[PDB]
Design a protein around this ligand. Structure first.
Ligand SMILES: OC[C@H]1O[C@H](O[C@H]2[C@H](O)[C@@H](O)[C@@H](O[C@H]3[C@H](O)[C@@H](O)[C@@H](O)O[C@@H]3CO)O[C@@H]2CO)[C@H](O)[C@@H](O)[C@@H]1O
Length: 459
């Protein structure tokens, strides 16, 4: 369904998709080829479902951590840049898009979280995490708060979890050891325990998400946030005089954010592989194309040597790279998505007091290499489950409360009912998710078996 002779691109909604569209309207202005830029919700979860059916985009943009799983699933075309083009990008970015010795995507830009602070509220940002509670007590007297950031995505809390010793998968003897997971060790527990103590002492709210924290910082209600380069654009538009600096230390050790390399992969099922090769090598990864995107939403430290040189003088980019050097490059192994789902649940349940830090991380450690059926097939289940009330009755009193049950029933359509149902699942642990799978098996076995079958077809 990917029609030949055009280019469809998926990029995340927080990136500069209008800047990328400008690169595509010039590509169309030169070669006659139309390119459409799209930013669907959960594109990175849907791509494995739509690529295998000959749909989805020609080019998918995401951070490199998802790409090893796509490559293992046969969903990405091997990219064959010349040795002369490879020299235009830094070698460590090519390493991030290398899976089994082969290049599976084009590196675009290096991303790391930084501490972003309001210089009018906070001329001297805290050097340590341990200072933040006293800061917040001082700024609550003025009607403000110290810090707000997204607690719903584990990416934003990971720098604190890794500071004192948490890690994802240990790199040993040239490869990531998936039997050596570090999310429930003492250092991980110490970091998450500090986060929980911030919530307990009313220095943070467990409900804070991306838009709440962005709105709070950009309206001058909070003195700091934690975010990446893509967010700077909306702060420039605000009236906030902001700085970008090193993340606070924790127990005297740097916060260790996971470093992402924004990357562009080519659908293995695309009949436009060489039109995507030419758009990526000759129109995006130029100084002109990267500036069209970076001027929409900043990219961070771009992988193209010639343009990075120009932008490296930005103190915001210098701070991004200081944080990046204290952190670690994300693995790209297929187990990363299961790892992220496991840590999302642990962080959300610890923050809300539904689990202790110890229990939440112990559960995450056990599940870090196994991707659950309903997480893998969320979008297809929303679209294709037909008897929602039967699932609701099977979950009532085990996994669904009456307040949750009523919220789902109040939704008008089956996809919107399932959407609402799935909005509760980040807090469910493995056995709760198993209950939904067993209910689906009893009422719609053909659907489960269909999804299982197509997943195995990728191996
Ligand atoms: O929490 C569930 C979530 O886990 C996985 O998402 C992770 C991304 O794979 C990972 O790249 C990182 O995402 C951040 C991007 O790197 C960055 O460009 C920017 O957009 O912020 C993103 C975080 O919001 O971290 C997330 C985990 O937080 C998995 O791929 C998702 O499908 C899954 O929903």
């Amino acid at each position: 369904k990917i029609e030949e002779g055009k280019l469809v691109i998926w990029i995340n909604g927080d990136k500069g998709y209008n800047g990328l569209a400008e690169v595509g309207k010039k590509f169309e202005k030169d070669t006659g080829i139309k390119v459409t830029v799209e930013h669907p919700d959960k594109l990175e979860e849907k791509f494995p479902q739509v690529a295998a059916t000959g749909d989805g985009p020609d080019i998918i943009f995401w951070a490199h951590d998802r790409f090893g799983g796509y490559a293992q699933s046969g969903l990405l075309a091997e990219i064959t840049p010349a040795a002369a083009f490879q020299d235009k990008l830094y070698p460590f970015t090519w390493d991030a898009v290398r899976y089994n010795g082969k290049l599976i995507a084009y590196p675009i830009a290096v991303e790391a979280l930084s501490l972003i602070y309001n210089k009018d509220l906070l001329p001297n940002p805290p050097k340590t995490w341990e200072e933040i509670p006293a800061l917040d007590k001082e700024l609550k007297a003025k009607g403000k708060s110290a810090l707000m950031f997204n607690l719903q995505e584990p990416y934003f809390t990971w720098p604190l979890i890794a500071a004192d010793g948490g890690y994802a998968f240990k790199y040993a003897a040239g490869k990531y050891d998936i039997k050596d997971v570090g999310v429930d060790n003492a250092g991980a527990k110490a970091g998450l325990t500090f986060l929980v103590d911030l919530i307990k002492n009313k220095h943070m709210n467990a409900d804070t998400d991306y838009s709440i924290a962005e709105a709070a910082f950009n309206k001058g209600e909070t003195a700091m946030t934690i975010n990446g380069p893509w967010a700077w654009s909306n702060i420039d538009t605000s009236a906030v005089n902001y700085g970008v600096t090193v993340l606070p230390t924790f127990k005297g050790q740097p916060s260790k954010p996971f470093v992402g390399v924004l990357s562009a992969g080519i659908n293995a099922a695309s009949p436009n592989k060489e039109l995507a090769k030419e758009f990526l090598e000759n129109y995006l990864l130029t100084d002109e194309g990267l500036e069209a995107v970076n001027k929409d939403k900043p990219l961070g430290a771009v992988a193209l040597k010639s343009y990075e040189e120009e932008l490296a003088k930005d103190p915001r980019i210098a701070a991004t790279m200081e944080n990046a050097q204290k952190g670690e490059i994300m693995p790209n192994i297929p187990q990363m998505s299961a790892f992220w789902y496991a840590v999302r649940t642990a962080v959300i349940n610890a923050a809300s007091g539904r689990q202790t830090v110890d229990a939440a991380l112990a559960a995450a450690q056990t599940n870090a290499v196994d991707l659950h059926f309903i997480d893998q097939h969320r979008a297809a289940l929303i679209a294709r489950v037909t008897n929602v009330e039967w699932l609701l009755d099977a979950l009532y009193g085990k996994v669904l409360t009456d307040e949750q049950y009523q919220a789902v029933r109040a939704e008008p359509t089956n996809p919107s009912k399932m959407r609402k149902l799935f909005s509760f699942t980040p807090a469910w642990n493995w056995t709760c998710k198993d209950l939904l799978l067993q209910a689906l098996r009893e009422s719609q076995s053909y659907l489960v078996e269909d999804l299982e079958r197509s997943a195995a077809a990728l191996e």
